[PDB]
Design a binder for this molecule. Structure first.
Ligand SMILES: CC(=O)N[C@H]1[C@H](O[C@H]2[C@@H](O)[C@@H](CO)O[C@H](O[C@@H]3[C@H](O)[C@@H](O)[C@H](O[C@H]4[C@H](O)[C@@H](O)[C@H](O)O[C@@H]4CO)O[C@@H]3CO)[C@@H]2O)O[C@H](CO)[C@H](O)[C@@H]1O[C@@H]1O[C@H](CO)[C@H](O)[C@H](O)[C@H]1O
Ligand SMILES: *[C@@H]1O[C@H](CO[C@@H]2O[C@@H](C)[C@@H](O)[C@@H](O)[C@@H]2O)[C@@H](O[C@@H]2O[C@H](CO)[C@@H](O)[C@H](O)[C@H]2NC(C)=O)[C@H](O)[C@H]1NC(C)=O
Ligand SMILES: *[C@@H]1O[C@H](CO)[C@@H](O[C@@H]2O[C@H](CO)[C@@H](O)[C@H](O)[C@H]2NC(C)=O)[C@H](O)[C@H]1NC(C)=O
Ligand SMILES: O=c1ccn([C@@H]2O[C@H](COP(=O)(O)OP(=O)(O)O)[C@@H](O)[C@H]2O)c(=O)[nH]1
Ligand SMILES: [Mn+2]
Length: 267
C-alpha cells in the first residue's frame, strides 16, 4: 500500500476489539508519550483488546525525520506514508489510517480516529459499544448535522467556493474523535477516490459515508463526545468518551486523578 512504517502487530492472529488511530505532527512527541502513558496504553478492557497507533506523514526537517525513525524503532506503533504532514493534508493522514485498517487489520471490531489534544475514556467507550449491539455500518461521535462551510478567508477552517462549492456540509462527526465499526474502513477506502476531495478530514469522511448510505447515530442517550471541552471532575470524566482541549500535562494530571480516585463511588 506504499507504507514507510507498519506497526509490529498481527490482527489476524488476535483481532483487536478497539483500534485507536491518533493524529499528531512530527514535533508533538510529548503528546504521543502522554497518550502512550495514559489512555493509549494497550491492555485488555473487560477482556477486549485495545491497540493504539500513531499516524504520521513525512517532513522536510532531517532532524524530525531521524527523531521519528528512532521513535518508531523504539515503540513500533507508528503508521507512516510519504506525504507532507501539514494541517491541510489531514485528509491524507486520515485516509492513511483507514487504508491501514483495510489492508492490515480488517478484523478490528471498532476503530476510533482521534486527535492528540484529547482525553479518551476507553473503558466507558468499550462499555457503550458492547451495549450498542452494532457490528457493521456503524459510525458515531459528536454529530455535526447542519454545518455550513466557513467562508471567513483567514479562518483555520476556511474553504473557498472552489474548494467546496455548496451551501451545507454533509452530516459528519467532529474530527476530534469519532468511532466506526471496522468494516466501515474498507467501504470508505473503496469509495474515497470517487468522492469530491476536501481538505477537512472529518467532512471528507462524512462525504464518503453519505455516498455509502451509512447513517450517523448517537453512541448513547447522553452526550459522550465533547469537542468544546469540559470542566474536569472525576465523576464526570468517568461517564464520557472523549474530551477536547487537553494538553499533555493536563492529560497526565487527569489520568493521575482517575487513578488516585479509583475505587470511590460517584453520585
Ligand atoms: C476544534 C473543532 O471542533 N473544529 C472544527 C470546526 O468546528 C467549528 C464549526 O463547527 C463552526 C461552525 O459554526 O462552529 C464552531 O466554531 C465557531 C467559529 O466557526 C470558529 O471560527 C470560532 O473559532 C475561532 C475564531 O473564529 C477565531 O477568531 C479565534 O481566534 O479562534 C477561535 C478558536 O480557534 O469559534 C466558533 C465557536 O467555537 C466550531 O468550533 O469545524 C470545522 C469544519 O468547518 C472542522 O470540523 C473542525 O474540526 C477539525 O477539522 C480538521 C479537518 O482536517 C480535523 O478533522 C480535526 O481533527 C478537527 O478537530
Ligand atoms: C442489546 O441486546 C441486549 C441483550 O438482549 C438480547 O439480545 C439482543 C440482540 C436482542 O435480540 C434482545 O431481544 C435479546 O434479549 C439488550 O439488553 C437486554 O435487555 C434486557 C431486557 O430489556 C435486560 O434484562 C438486559 O439489559 C439485557 N438482557 C440480556 C438477556 O442480555 C440491550 O437492550 C440491547 N441494546 C440495544 C442498544 O438495543
Ligand atoms: C500534501 O502532501 C503532498 C505529498 O507530500 C504534497 O505534494 C508534494 O509537494 C511537494 C512540495 O511541498 C512537491 O515537491 C511534490 O511534487 C508534491 N507531490 C505530490 C505527489 O503532490 C502536498 O503539497 C501537500 N499538501 C499541502 C497543502 O501541503
Ligand atoms: O501538521 C499537522 C497538524 C495537526 N495535526 C494533528 O491534527 C489534529 C488537529 O489539530 P488541531 O488541534 O490544531 O486542530 P483544531 O482541533 O484546533 O481544529 C491534532 O491531533 C494535531 O496534532 C497533525 O497530525 N499534523
Ligand atoms: Mn484540536
Amino acid at each position: 500500500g506504499n507504507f514507510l512504517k507498519l506497526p509490529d502487530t498481527d490482527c489476524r492472529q488476535t483481532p483487536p476489539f478497539l483500534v485507536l488511530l491518533v493524529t499528531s505532527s512530527h514535533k508533538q512527541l510529548a503528546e504521543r508519550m502522554a497518550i502512550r502513558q495514559t489512555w493509549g496504553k494497550e491492555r485488555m478492557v473487560k477482556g477486549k483488546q485495545l491497540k493504539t497507533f500513531f499516524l504520521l506523514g513525512t517532513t522536510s526537517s532531517a532532524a524530525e525525520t531521524k527523531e521519528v525513525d528512532q521513535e518508531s524503532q523504539r515503540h513500533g506503533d507508528i503508521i507512516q506514508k510519504d506525504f507532507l504532514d501539514v494541517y491541510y493534508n489531514l485528509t491524507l493522514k486520515t485516509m492513511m489510517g483507514i487504508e491501514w485498517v483495510h489492508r492490515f487489520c480488517p478484523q478490528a471490531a471498532f476503530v476510533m480516529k482521534t486527535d492528540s489534544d484529547m482525553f479518551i475514556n476507553v473503558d466507558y467507550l468499550t462499555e457503550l459499544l458492547l451495549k450498542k449491539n452494532r457490528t457493521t455500518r456503524f459510525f458515531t461521535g459528536f454529530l455535526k448535522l447542519n454545518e455550513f462551510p466557513i467562508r471567513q478567508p483567514f479562518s483555520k477552517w476556511f474553504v473557498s467556493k472552489s474548494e467546496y462549492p455548496w451551501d451545507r456540509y454533509p452530516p459528519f462527526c467532529s474530527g476530534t474523535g469519532y468511532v466506526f465499526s471496522g468494516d466501515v474502513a474498507s467501504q470508505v477506502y473503496n469509495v474515497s477516490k470517487s468522492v469530491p476531495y476536501i481538505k477537512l478530514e472529518d467532512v471528507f469522511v462524512g462525504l464518503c459515508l453519505e455516498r455509502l448510505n451509512i447513517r450517523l447515530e448517537e453512541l448513547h442517550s447522553q452526550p459522550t463526545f465533547f469537542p468544546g471541552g469540559l470542566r474536569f471532575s472525576v465523576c464526570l470524566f468517568r461517564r464520557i468518551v472523549a474530551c477536547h482541549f487537553i494538553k499533555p500535562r493536563t492529560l497526565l494530571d487527569y489520568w493521575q486523578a482517575l487513578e488516585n480516585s479509583r475505587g470511590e463511588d460517584c453520585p
